[PDB]
Structure 1
Amino acid sequence: KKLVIKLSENPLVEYVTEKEYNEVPVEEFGDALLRGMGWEIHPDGLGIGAK
């Protein structure tokens, strides 16, 4: 239903890869990373008054 990603807390990855994006879309990563952390013109010339 909803996707939730939590970070690892304290060997390297060369690239994200095509397969990874298919599972977690780019729209979904912005919500899911937060949810894993617990989200759930002035006119040309006037004075400061100048009605």
Structure 2
Amino acid sequence: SKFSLKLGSKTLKKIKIQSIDKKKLVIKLSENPLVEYVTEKEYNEVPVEEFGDALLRGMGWEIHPDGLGIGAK
């Protein structure tokens, strides 16, 4: 006996912080079946400059004049 209507769903249709406060490559050898080639992918991971340091760090690195005598000032 009143004015009532139904509105259903079928009818119609940056880092968060809590508080504010005040790298190196290492290769170790295997110690006692064969690899044909190094491959392109491998060099990309370990560059040629990096292999000389990293293998050591895995092991624990961290003109005389024309004529004179031996004196001859």
Gaps of 5+ in 1: none
- When Rg is computed on C-alpha atoms for both structures, the one with the higher figure is 2
Does the residue aligned with 1:4 lie in a helix, a strand or coil?
coil
Gaps of 5+ in 2: 1-22
> Percent of aligned positions with the same letter in both sequences?
100
Structure 2-normalised TM-score?
Answer: 0.70
Structure 1-normalised TM-score?
Answer: 1.00
User: In the alignment, what sits opposite 1:10?
Assistant: 32
Name which structure has the greater RCO, CA cutoff 8 Å, separation 6+: 1
TM superposition shift of 1:16: 0.0
Following the alignment from structure 2 to structure 1, what is the Cα–Cα distance between the partners of residues 31 and 67?
55
Following the alignment from structure 1 to structure 2, what is the Cα–Cα distance between the partners of residues 41 and 20?
43
Deviations 1:15-49 (A, max 9, x none): 00000000000000000000000000000000000
Following the alignment from structure 1 to structure 2, what is the Cα–Cα distance between the partners of residues 31 and 37?
10
Q: Please tell me whether residue 28 in structure 1 is matched to residue 53 in structure 2.
A: no
User: Once superposed, which parts of structure 1, at least 4 consecutive aligned residues long, lie more than 4 Å away?
Assistant: none
Alignment: residue pair count: 51
